[PDB]
Amino acid sequence: LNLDPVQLTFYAGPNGSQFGFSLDFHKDSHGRVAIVVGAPRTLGPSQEETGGVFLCPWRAEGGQCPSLLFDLRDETRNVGSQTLQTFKARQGLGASVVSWSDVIVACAPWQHWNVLEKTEEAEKTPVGSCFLAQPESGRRAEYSPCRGNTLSRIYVENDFSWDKRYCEAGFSSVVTQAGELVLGAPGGYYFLGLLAQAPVADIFSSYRPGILLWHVSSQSLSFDSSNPEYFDGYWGYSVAVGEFDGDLNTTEYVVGAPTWSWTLGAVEILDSYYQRLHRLRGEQMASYFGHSVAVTDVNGDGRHDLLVGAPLYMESRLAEVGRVYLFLQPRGPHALGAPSLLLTGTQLYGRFGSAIAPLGDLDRDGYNDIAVAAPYGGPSGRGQVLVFLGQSEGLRSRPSQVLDSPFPTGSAFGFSLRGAVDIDDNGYPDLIVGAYGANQVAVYRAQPVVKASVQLLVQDSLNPAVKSCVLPQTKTPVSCFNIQMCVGATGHNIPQKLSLNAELQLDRQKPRQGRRVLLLGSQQAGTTLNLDLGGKHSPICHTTMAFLRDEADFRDKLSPIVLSLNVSLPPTMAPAVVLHGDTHVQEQTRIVLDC
């Protein structure tokens, strides 16, 4: 709602693009936050297809960020017969970035790995990897469960089972609250999908430079499945962490399979033991249900809620426009299955739902908020971010704000969206929009929100011929009533330069020269006053006095008086304020005399 569109933070990257495929907020232990962006198609050791990650300090003007190296070299180790080796060709370092407690985990899902066992070989297959690093410490603990030495003949022998040659671990990187790192591998089990879990502390403990194999304590890998629906399931395409079970103190992983059950799609909730507590499938085939998955409690009830993206949805306008499915967390026995809000974009081929970013209390509204992105939406397919507030009792169905791509067509503005981290540390979380091949990363800063609570004090009714008030000049006896207005500013971090303007309307329904009551001071049927609330918490109530003419004067006495007070922000750069809540009170006064 309060995300500043007119001013944005622009971060540049390599001319080879991909700067913005994935990104996250690196929360420093000191309390600072900086944006870490993976560019999975930067230059290699010698102009090679590789990845790469940049670390941008949080700023406003922006610029060329420094680069954080993880691993770019074709290693080769001779374990007896097996001369195993790694290949950086199109590794994609930066396709998944997640940060936690001074550690950054950035993945290269398409990194290759071949083991030469004399004549036979393991084939140069994309096992993928995800490299961990504490930039302050400098320690690098690369993690790659799918790296192995089992030669291809063994795979071919029995049933091509328990394979990890092309798992592509790290297609989606997330980290729990405790620091446990979770990685997706869509290609695991012969292009079926597996997951990896390992403590970052344990990963750093068990890692040894040079050697290209380990087990790293009790790292938890997903179970291989022979179910036909899982074939080419593409599990671990997108992952997130949130609390969903009946017990606390445990972190669940939500994983998306956009091709589950013959491109139908699914999303699953897993514990650390991978018990599959809940699984919700898609509705439209080839709609890519699960491309991006987000976890946040926008309802404000505390219990986390689920958002699932289907950018390839074909709306029954059969127009290819994505859709975000919302799932509030209920208190039923087997609840959470039925979706509640189905948000759908407008621009054709917009891919509405490629990036769902939790935002938390974006506008100090008391409920969490979200930002969905359609990378090819908008007027001319540029791509647009749709901010949806909590609003309680569900989610804001309408876009509280629409952020337009300032990038040319095809930049896919809005592929990776992250929020839920107050970058301004002002109770107002910000948003970051990165896009694959964008070459630029945009950051939206939220602005203070002012809720208004408005009340009126007007006499309910009176005799038009009371004749108690006295006109100054003419000295005529007239009836009159007490008109007062009190508007107060609620919310957090309200700016002290507030200049709210209140406009009063007496007999609003009646037109001009059809009006009945009329102000003494200004001789007008309505005025605006600077009812500024800046610099104080108490409401301002400056009254007025409008006279009511004699019976014989007018004839609109049969019409009851309408007293509508409407408060609006001043019209006079960036407003830095968003009026919300009650802003128009129309308490009424009727005319009562005999009939």
């Binding site: 398409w110 012969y190 085939m285 020269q513 004839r555």
Partner: protein
């Protein structure tokens, strides 16, 4: 009868109701803005108001052919072809069109084959097909062009075996066999009627092998459709595209597995090498883009998929109108009958709307040829060359873009109709508007065909008074035309 239109100027009376008119006489300022028959009753007999035309006048029409001689204009299937429409704002007009299948119709057929190892044997059953296909299609054509093309999958690392280096030269090295380097999509044989050249260009095909079941067929369909010049689709022909495969296929954004993210554009890249030049450097096409490009070029599509993946592919037919699925045999020796039934099923009428500008249309179940039987709506039973009647009710306010001509073209047939729909909303007197009517407040009133339209307080019949200034001037009465409260209420004086 007070009616509704009575309860501002020439334009408003042409927009409030389809029936009421605005007497545009500057000699006489009665209901004025009311029903035209009432205007005759209140003596507006000349009816100076220029009503909107609100009817369709054709500009170009030709009779529907029966069998088709062969000329471009002698095989007319859709009547009419160019009409002009001038509906009034908020008015609905239903007009009928007649479409034909022209019976005999030259056909273009392109055969896309999954050149994977799993159906290499099937390629053998395809070696001698041109003679049989020509024999089975001669009865239902007069100029039958055929062409051939092959798809395997995107030749990228997760799908294409990349080591040992002999796998690049021979992907089936490990089974002690020789195959061809894997390719995305290649243009083997251009569209032609020469069966000898077809069976010559076949038998020269070497299959390849991919790592996984999902094939890259849709990326081949895209380039087959867009490269109309390369494939050689005729300007006037019944287009088909037979597509034979055994397993799943990749969809859009799957290229992230291969690391390629750029979505499928709308250009042709099949170059002189007759191969998909940018297969690796582009994502697989979405189903929506597939439907869009299969309907823009009228290229109907036929799915010859094995029994394993029928349900997967037939469900795509729902999301891609104009396509059919077929249970291809394991040996793929039944594709001849598959193409026969494809031509006998989808060419047997689909009405679809295109480039529609505030408009809405609906067809009232006319069909048949010129009759209207709501019972026999989805009766089918059409053999060939069937006329069909489609009466669409175009419903519209007044669009700001006065000039507009939208196109309606059915599925597959290139014969299209152009509706120059130009809504009439204003008046000729409105263009005149009499800006300085002498009788209206001393020659300053813009007498809009019956209404003065002037003055903040002097806005009467001659811009002289208003509902305001009500009080107990002597005209209708010595009060404030001129009576009790505001202008004049007769009897109240």
């Amino acid at each position: 009868g007070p009616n509704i239109c009575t309860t501002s100027s020439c334009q408003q009376c042409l927009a409030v109701s389809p029936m009421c008119a605005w007497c545009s006489d500057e000699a006489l300022p009665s209901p004025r803005c009311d029903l035209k028959e009432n205007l005759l009753k209140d003596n507006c007999a000349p009816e100076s108001i220029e009503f909107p035309v609100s009817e369709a006048r054709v500009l170009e029409d030709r009779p529907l052919s029966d069998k088709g001689s062969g000329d471009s204009s002698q095989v007319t299937q859709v009547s009419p072809q160019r009409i002009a429409l001038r509906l009034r704002p908020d008015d609905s007009k239903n007009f009928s069109i007649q479409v034909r299948q022209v019976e005999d119709y030259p056909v273009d057929i392109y055969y896309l084959m999954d050149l994977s190892y799993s159906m290499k044997d099937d390629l053998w059953s395809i070696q001698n097909l041109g003679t049989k296909l020509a024999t089975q299609m001669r009865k239902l054509t007069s100029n039958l062009r055929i062409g051939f093309g092959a798809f395997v999958d995107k030749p990228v690392s997760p799908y294409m075996y990349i080591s040992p280096p002999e796998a690049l030269e021979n992907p089936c090295y490990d089974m002690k066999t020789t195959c061809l380097p894997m390719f995305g999509y290649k243009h083997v044989l251009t569209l032609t009627d020469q069966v000898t050249r077809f069976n010559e260009e076949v038998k020269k095909q070497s299959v390849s092998r991919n790592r996984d079941a999902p094939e890259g067929g849709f990326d081949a369909i895209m380039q087959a459709t867009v490269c109309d010049e390369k494939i050689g689709w005729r300007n006037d022909a019944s287009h088909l595209l037979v597509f034979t495969t055994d397993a799943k296929t990749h969809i859009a954004l799957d290229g992230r597995l291969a690391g390629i993210v750029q979505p499928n554009d709308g250009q042709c890249h099949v170059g002189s090498d007759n191969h998909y030049s940018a297969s690796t450097t582009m994502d697989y096409p979405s189903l929506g883009l597939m439907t869009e490009k299969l309907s823009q070029k009228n290229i109907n599509l036929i799915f010859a998929v094995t029994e394993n993946v029928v349900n997967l592919y037939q469900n795509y037919s729902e999301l891609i109108p104009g396509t059919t699925v077929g249970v291809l045999s394991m040996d793929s020796s039944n594709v001849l009958q598959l193409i026969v039934d494809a031509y006998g099923k989808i060419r047997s009428v689909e009405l679809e709307v295109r480039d529609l500008p505030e408009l809405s249309l609906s067809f009232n179940a006319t069909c048949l040829n010129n009759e209207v039987i709501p019972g026999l709506k989805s009766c089918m039973g059409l053999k060939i060359g069937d006329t069909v009647s489609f009466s669409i009710e175009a419903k519209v306010g007044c669009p700001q873009e006065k000039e507009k001509s939208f196109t309606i073209k059915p599925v597959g047939f290139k014969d299209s109709l152009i509706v120059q729909v130009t809504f009439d909303c204003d008046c000729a007197c409105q263009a005149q508007a009499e800006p300085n009517s002498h009788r209206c407040n001393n020659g300053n009133g813009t007498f809009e065909c019956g209404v003065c339209r002037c003055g903040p307080g002097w806005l009467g019949s001659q811009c002289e008074c208003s509902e305001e200034d009500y009080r107990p001037q002597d005209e209708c009465s010595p009060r404030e035309v001129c009576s009790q409260r505001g202008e004049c209420l007769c009897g109240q004086c």
